Amino acid sequence: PRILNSDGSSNITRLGLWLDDHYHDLLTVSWPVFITLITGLYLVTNALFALAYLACGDVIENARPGSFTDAFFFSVQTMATIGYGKLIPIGPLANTLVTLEALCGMLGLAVAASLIYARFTRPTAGVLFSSRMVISDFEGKPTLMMRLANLRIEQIIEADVHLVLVRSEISQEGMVFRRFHDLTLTRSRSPIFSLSWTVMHPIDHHSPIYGETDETLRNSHSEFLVLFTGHHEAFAQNVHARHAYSCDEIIWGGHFVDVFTTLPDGRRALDLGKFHEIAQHHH
Amino acid sequence: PRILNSDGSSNITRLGLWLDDHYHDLLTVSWPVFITLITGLYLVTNALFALAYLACGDVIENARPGSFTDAFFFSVQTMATIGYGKLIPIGPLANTLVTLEALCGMLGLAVAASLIYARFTRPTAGVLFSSRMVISDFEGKPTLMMRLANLRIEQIIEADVHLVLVRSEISQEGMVFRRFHDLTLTRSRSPIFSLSWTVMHPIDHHSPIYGETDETLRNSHSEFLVLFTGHHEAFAQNVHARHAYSCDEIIWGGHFVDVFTTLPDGRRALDLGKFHEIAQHHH
Amino acid sequence: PRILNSDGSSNITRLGLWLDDHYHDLLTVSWPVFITLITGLYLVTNALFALAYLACGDVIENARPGSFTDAFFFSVQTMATIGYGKLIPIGPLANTLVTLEALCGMLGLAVAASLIYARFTRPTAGVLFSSRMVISDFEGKPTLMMRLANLRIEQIIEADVHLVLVRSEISQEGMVFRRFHDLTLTRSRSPIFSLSWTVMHPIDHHSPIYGETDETLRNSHSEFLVLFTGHHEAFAQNVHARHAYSCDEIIWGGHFVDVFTTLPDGRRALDLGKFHEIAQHHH
Amino acid sequence: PRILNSDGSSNITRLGLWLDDHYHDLLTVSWPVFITLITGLYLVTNALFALAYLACGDVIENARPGSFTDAFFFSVQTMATIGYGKLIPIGPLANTLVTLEALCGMLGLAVAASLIYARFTRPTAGVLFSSRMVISDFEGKPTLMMRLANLRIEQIIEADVHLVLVRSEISQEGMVFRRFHDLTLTRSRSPIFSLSWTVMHPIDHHSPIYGETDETLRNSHSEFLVLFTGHHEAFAQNVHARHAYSCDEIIWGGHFVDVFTTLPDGRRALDLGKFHEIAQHHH
Ligand SMILES: O=C(O)CCP(=O)(CCC(=O)O)CCC(=O)O
Ligand SMILES: O=C(O)CCP(=O)(CCC(=O)O)CCC(=O)O
Ligand SMILES: O=C(O)CCP(=O)(CCC(=O)O)CCC(=O)O
Ligand SMILES: O=C(O)CCP(=O)(CCC(=O)O)CCC(=O)O
Ligand SMILES: [Ba+2]
Ligand SMILES: [Cl-]
Ligand SMILES: [Cl-]
Ligand SMILES: [Cl-]
Ligand SMILES: [Cl-]
Ligand SMILES: [K+]
Ligand SMILES: [K+]
Ligand SMILES: [K+]
Ligand SMILES: [K+]
Ligand SMILES: [K+]
Ligand SMILES: [K+]
Ligand SMILES: [K+]
Ligand SMILES: [K+]
Ligand SMILES: [K+]
Ligand SMILES: [K+]
Ligand SMILES: [K+]
Ligand SMILES: [K+]
Ligand SMILES: [K+]
Ligand SMILES: [K+]
Ligand SMILES: [K+]
């Protein structure tokens, strides 16, 4: 049973212990729920203004006396600023409510637009993670690797990547705990991430997985979390993506197949058809 | 008497020495004050336009001659763009004012929406701090610790934490002063803060509190300030939270109770009911 | 054939393998396409509301019975909240649709404004790159250099620069690959970039181009990518710019001509007429 | 003649060499110019729509035939969506223009609001710089110092400061140039800047001003630039401030007067009346 899922979310059960987090919740409910809440508030406030006009008397021209329906639709036409001109206010009180309601309609528009824009400007990174990792020799050292691909044509600026080991350990005091290790990489920063990036942790005598095997990684229930971040040109915003691997998803001795190549007519090409392809020696 | 309160604010009295900081003040006044200011400006500018129309003569059809009331509500219906159609402008001057007022109504909407959105997009971190710190042995060293919990389901990216000692000191010149020490941590950066994070300062021979006791920390009026920051997924914005501890809130020999556990049916769980629980040996 | 073009884009052919990336695409299509899409949606939704009213019967006063045209323009006048007052709704159903349509008109405005603002707030850096690099002796070492100029009067805060070597290499395992080297600079950070900045990589015995010649750089198909980033005062936003050089664009022995000078009357001046000027000794 | 002014701007004369930078210029022109440009565009586009209606014939009810004035104000009432109801469109062509104009009015509102909000959300840091620097002994070393004060009640998160020496130098090749040195500080980062911060560069044997005097600093025309940056709580935005000092503004042997004190009744206080006060020994 894996703790981190492939998408980087955790299976940990949160035991725990309406408006406690309202701004957050307005941004994170589904769009159908969000639009329902806006609509609900919009209908509720029109009904309240409708009652306000009735409480003043018959102050709506061409409205049936005592009709909530006519007062409601006049409220709509006032708050939305349609102002057809058949239902119009009569007297100081009605005209004062109109002045207040028009302000409420404008303020409600500002609020709704603010929330919509805050929901919109949360772009995704558009990054693809290799389905597996590998451990194989590179530049004289066994090296843990995975790789990333850009699925968009715009580039990502000052891109950072982390390979994070999560495992259970024992302190010299005998205390058992899970902790994370942000592994040392050959490249942790790419000034411009463009097409594809192979992320590499050389396993030298300082690596937390130095001397480890498939068996000893499972014994410590080791998992690997990958975080990618950068400033995406398409949005002028920071983006981030995550992924996680289990011990079952490390190919010991594996070598990623090159995705960069030179076509027969000479021009260099990227072939993401090979992105998840890994070569192994079969004995 | 503590200088820093538990929430990270200071009790220092600012001795010191209307529109001096207007943008800042518009964003930091309470919402009732903010809405009152918008409403006030909205009513003031309609009155000024009302006087403008009267200064042109009887240029509002169906308006009583010389009536400020009728000119005021016509101004409202024009600036808010309701345009019921009973009060309408007559002649070039009135129609020019309408053209200007409609622009003012649209610009005022843009301004109000800009301020509302700037007030909205200041999210809180949703982080909980342990009510105490502890000092106890971990990995062979006495270690100062506190911990954090995420109260939301979304994660925080590239999370940073600081444990800051603030105390009074004496230079070799004999000058007395208070300064801060950003303490060295075992982990200062969590690429993905998800559920709970124990922040640890090992007290080695380079620590500014090496050899210190409860007595000597009080003698220097030592306090501890914690800053958490990170990029919150729910908002695509950086968030931050702070907390402070006094010497009374350090449990020497204390050990935090585990909040992570494995339920009987095997699945891993987080129990924040234990978040503030600390174990001590009683002699 | 260069891989990186002068503007920092790559000539690599992306082999590969409607609403799959809709938010991104709405922000990156050309403005004519964007406005066409907004207009299209705006006309489509008015037609749908027009059919809605007709499906209710003859519920639009002064509208010809069964006329899609009259129902369409009444829908426009309702969604845009013009409300001339000739075409008005009749009965509960029509007035309910008006209430829904006004909400749709306001929500569509919020959506369009959110997208327009997200497209707008992606400012350019306003930085000029020297058309060439040079390698010449400075402070006792052969040093690779290029330079930047600010084309605006506002300054750029916490400016970072990278000189990135990209070349083909061979590992001791015999694997061939292209990788990047973020070269060590004398100054990688300028707290305030104001007018012009000469970026320098001293070629010491640790430099990846130590001992290299024009010939050996071409043999490894070496290219140089420059990234500039910083917080632009004019926008209160991070900006970035990029540029790339080939081996043909390095002047060995070249010295940039000073762009800073003191005018005859004593005041210091910047002369960007000399920005691309390089001096060479001719033997 | 100083190059950097006290406010951090430079006196360097930019020799050099309508819509070349339009987005930048819309955000940086004065507010009167900005509002004039919006108004101008608003009047120009209404005139063009007015001509459009006239080109269709007498398609505006209650409008005088051939009157540009009546067509202009009908355009205003349509683009602003006032729709009084006296001037109304007649026929397919006029009603099509209305549909287009309403869209233009909504798009123009989105554009204006986007620009206004981009102009608004550029907050100032609210930081005060000491009018002078000092050089005096601290913790066994001559130390260059200045200090900062927060003029607001909200705090600044992850605050960074730079003390930057700018001076003219000579390389071993004999080349003369001005360069900057970002000086090593005792504290360059304050996790929470709250009230006042004394910034200190210890002048040890590695300092670029080690062994320097008032005379030798003037000979190299040395100036000192200070940059402050941080995440301001009031805005949830990064802010920055700058200041510069000349050799005339360094008090050799000076000691800043404490701004923190304990009032007679015991509570700690900040007295910014002393912020610019410096003590000197008079011989
Ligand atoms: O790390 C990798 O796997 C690729 C490094 P590059 O510099 C190789 C480019 C080529 O072979 O043509 C690509 C870096 C990037 O696209 O971001
Ligand atoms: O530092 C801690 O107290 C927890 C470290 P983790 O890696 C432990 C996870 C587990 O025991 O299942 C949790 C890190 C996080 O949630 O951000
Ligand atoms: O690196 C350069 O080429 C210029 C360094 P500066 O400090 C020279 C200023 C002068 O000669 O007057 C300019 C730095 C900047 O404008 O950002
Ligand atoms: O650097 C300074 O001059 C002040 C350091 P502090 O920690 C002194 C606080 C006191 O004396 O009460 C203040 C730091 C801050 O306000 O940001
Ligand atoms: Ba309207
Ligand atoms: Cl740890
Ligand atoms: Cl200090
Ligand atoms: Cl690499
Ligand atoms: Cl330099
Ligand atoms: K409206
Ligand atoms: K209207
Ligand atoms: K009307
Ligand atoms: K409105
Ligand atoms: K924003
Ligand atoms: K309006
Ligand atoms: K409006
Ligand atoms: K932003
Ligand atoms: K509208
Ligand atoms: K109307
Ligand atoms: K009418
Ligand atoms: K509207
Ligand atoms: K708006
Ligand atoms: K409008
Ligand atoms: K509008």
Residue numbers in the entry:
A (entry chain A), B (entry chain A), C (entry chain A), D (entry chain A): 12 to 28, 33 to 298
Show passages lifted from the paper.
Potassium channels propagate electrical signals, maintain membrane potentials and facilitate numerous downstream cellular processes. KirBac3.1 adopts the canonical fold of a K+ channel, with inner and outer membrane-spanning helices supporting an inclined, shorter, pore helix that supports the signature selectivity filter. All feature an hourglass-like constriction at the intracellular opening, leading to the widespread conclusion that the canonical permeation gate at the helix bundle crossing is closed (or nearly so) in all Kir structures, whether determined by crystallography or single-particle cryo-EM. Thus, data presented here indicate that inward rectifiers (Kir) are able to conduct without requiring the substantial conformational changes predicted by the canonical gating mechanism.
A near atomic resolution crystal structure (2.0 Å) of wild-type KirBac3.1 was determined, providing an accurate starting model for simulations. Steered molecular dynamics simulations, in which K+ ions are moved from the transmembrane cavity to the cytosol, were carried out on the pore of KirBac3.1 (residues 33–138 of the 2.0 Å structure) embedded in a POPC membrane separating saline reservoirs. Over the duration of the simulations the narrowness of the shallow intracellular opening did not prevent K+ passing through. The simulations report free-energy barriers at the Tyr132 collar of 6 kJ mol−1 for wild type and 1 kJ mol−1 for the disulfide-linked mutant. These values fall within the range expected for thermal fluctuations and are too low to impair K+ flux. Within the pore cavity, K+ diffuses with a coordination number of approximately six. A fleeting reduction in the number of solvating water molecules to three or four occurs as the ion passes through the collar of tyrosine side chains but is almost immediately replenished. Transient interactions between K+ and the Tyr132-hydroxyl groups occur after the ions pass the low energetic barrier near the center of the tyrosine aromatic ring. The retention of a kernel of water molecules means the free-energy barrier to permeation at the constriction is not prohibitive.
